[PDB]
Amino acid sequence: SGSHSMRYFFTSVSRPGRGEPRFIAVGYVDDTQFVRFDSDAASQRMEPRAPWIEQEGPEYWDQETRNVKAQSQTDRVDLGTLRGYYNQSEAGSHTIQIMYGCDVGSDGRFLRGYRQDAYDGKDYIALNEDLRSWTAADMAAQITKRKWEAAHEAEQLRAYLDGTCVEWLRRYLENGKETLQRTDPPKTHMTHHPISDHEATLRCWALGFYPAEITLTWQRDGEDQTQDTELVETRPAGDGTFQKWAAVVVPSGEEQRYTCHVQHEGLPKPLTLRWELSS
């Protein structure tokens, strides 16, 4: 509830006979982007995306550039290797995705570390919660799991996920404490849109909230509506805040039967919204 996270996301996309793969890396503290690398950008450097990281010195940018450029060269090999494992041709575009990070509690103590890899939009291999073993998703990926077990990659990575990652997360949170400790609860409201003379869409809104996790439910007379609810995916406002809505189509005159329940870390009490007609 006062817990935080540091995550890096990598995507490598092979370009058949058109040069090197498109590589894009992003790091995040909670839901705030703070670094970026894009193999097609001008700088060819890891670049800052949050003011509180701008402060880091030229050796920090030098080391993050070298490590992220390397990560992409190891993703470029892996695309060729995984093409071999899944017996695919050299003609098609393929994708590797990687995500890794750690979480701390409100007092800065390690909670969790993770690393998850994917090939063409499906699970390939992931590190287990214990941080000392792997789970492969199929028999191709079990080959990777044997290399990494041989080289004891889990134990080097554990030292980062439960050590280095936690110390740098704790620093970024201290260095960025203006930006990062702010929780914004949702500004909620309800709108009403007749479909016809006899029905209308009720839409329950949640606006300007941070961080992105939220729940929106529709109850009719205290019973859930999970089947007739239209839910949209949570979305960025573009100012660092998030938005979502949910809708139910209801018979005209029955609006006051329906409730929209809103849950967010910021909110003291879960909000209950009702469309109340004239008095």
Binding site: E64, D117, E153, L157, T164
Partner: peptide, 9 residues
């Protein structure tokens, strides 16, 4: 900061 490389898959 980014994590140290893993060896090839």
């Amino acid at each position: 900061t980014t994590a140290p490389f893993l060896s090839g898959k």
